[PDB]
Amino acid sequence: GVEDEPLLRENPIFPIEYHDIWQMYKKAEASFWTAEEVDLSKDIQHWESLKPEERYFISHVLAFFAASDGIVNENLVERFSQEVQITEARCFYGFQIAMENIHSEMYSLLIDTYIKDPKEREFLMPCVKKKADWALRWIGDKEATYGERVVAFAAVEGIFFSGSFASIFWLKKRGPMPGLTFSNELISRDEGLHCDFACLMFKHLVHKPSEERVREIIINAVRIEQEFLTEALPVKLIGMNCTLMKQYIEFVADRLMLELGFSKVFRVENPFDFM
């Protein structure tokens, strides 16, 4: 029933029809940044002073972020930006793809700098790919509605990285590593705005999935993220409490629900007062 969707139906570019969308493109635009603005010189001095558990962890979280912004960008290219046929939402998606490419680079500048041997670089991982069946499936499914798929990538960019951004912010106070922590600040701000944008699109969608459907996608997204940070790569390795991290995930997942216009599912407070 796509004819009834203002967002998706075909149409006849500074007569601004969608101010809320446009205001976010210019917000994304105004936060432009490139890898070379992030000084990584002063880092190996700190990476050297780390524990070895703190390196198996930081290296792995960086590597999960490599196999992550590539799936986000494979979806906006060959699905989202094709479908959405209104002008303002295409500029944003156009700018988003540009930044997802810079994020992808930044993570690789980091991994090249913290790992000089290519044989190490090769794990990619049965550790990480738990989300493939959830994620890459919402690229691959031809029955998945736009509405389901918008909520889906709201979850990827807002739940799935949330813990990892929390980790780097935790390391940052304990103490610095300006490459990791300055990139992370910029990258976590970008993902918030992308995640907010996914929400704005949802709001403009007449036909959306039932609450139970939206809850399912999010609840399930959270469990997979909780599993990654408490078992597959415990934030224990860098001195953090698992329970608190499982709980932060849920705070973030609830904050998404409120923003998609639905009720809290978990009701937990934010455990981390730095976030």
Instruction: Provide the annotated binding site for Fe cation.
Output: 69, 100, 103, 157, 191, 194
Whether residue 56 lies in the annotated active site: no
159 touches 222 (CB < 8 A): yes
The least distance separating a second copy from the CB of residue 15, rounded to whole angstroms, comes to: 8
Question: Of residues 118-157, which lie at the interface with Fe ion (CB under 5 A)?
Answer: 157
> Which among 228, 206, 209 has a CA at the least distance from the CA of 217?
209
- Find the binder of a second copy among 83, 105, 196, 216 (CB under 8 A): 105
CA 249 – CA 246 distance, rounded (Å): 5
Q: In 76-86, where does DSSP find H-type helix?
A: 81-83
Pairwise CA distance, residues 150 & 224, whole Å: 18
Question: Considering only 90-98, 131-139, 164-172, 221-229, which stretch makes contact with a second copy by CB under 8 A?
Answer: 90-98
37 Cβ contact list (under 8 Å, min separation 6): none
Q: Tokens 């932060």 belong to which residue?
A: 248
Residue 123 sits in the site that holds a second copy (CB under 8 A): no
Whole-number minimum distance, CB 126 to a second copy, in Å?
Answer: 18
14 binding partner (options a second copy, Fe ion, none; Cβ < 5 to 8 Å by kind): a second copy
Residue 161 CB, shortest distance to Fe ion, in Å, is: 8
Nearest to 252 by CA among 76, 244, 25, 145: 244
Which residues contact a second copy (rule: CB under 8 A)? 13-14, 29-30, 32, 34, 66, 70, 77-78, 81-82, 90-91, 94-95, 97-98, 101, 104-105, 108-109, 111-112
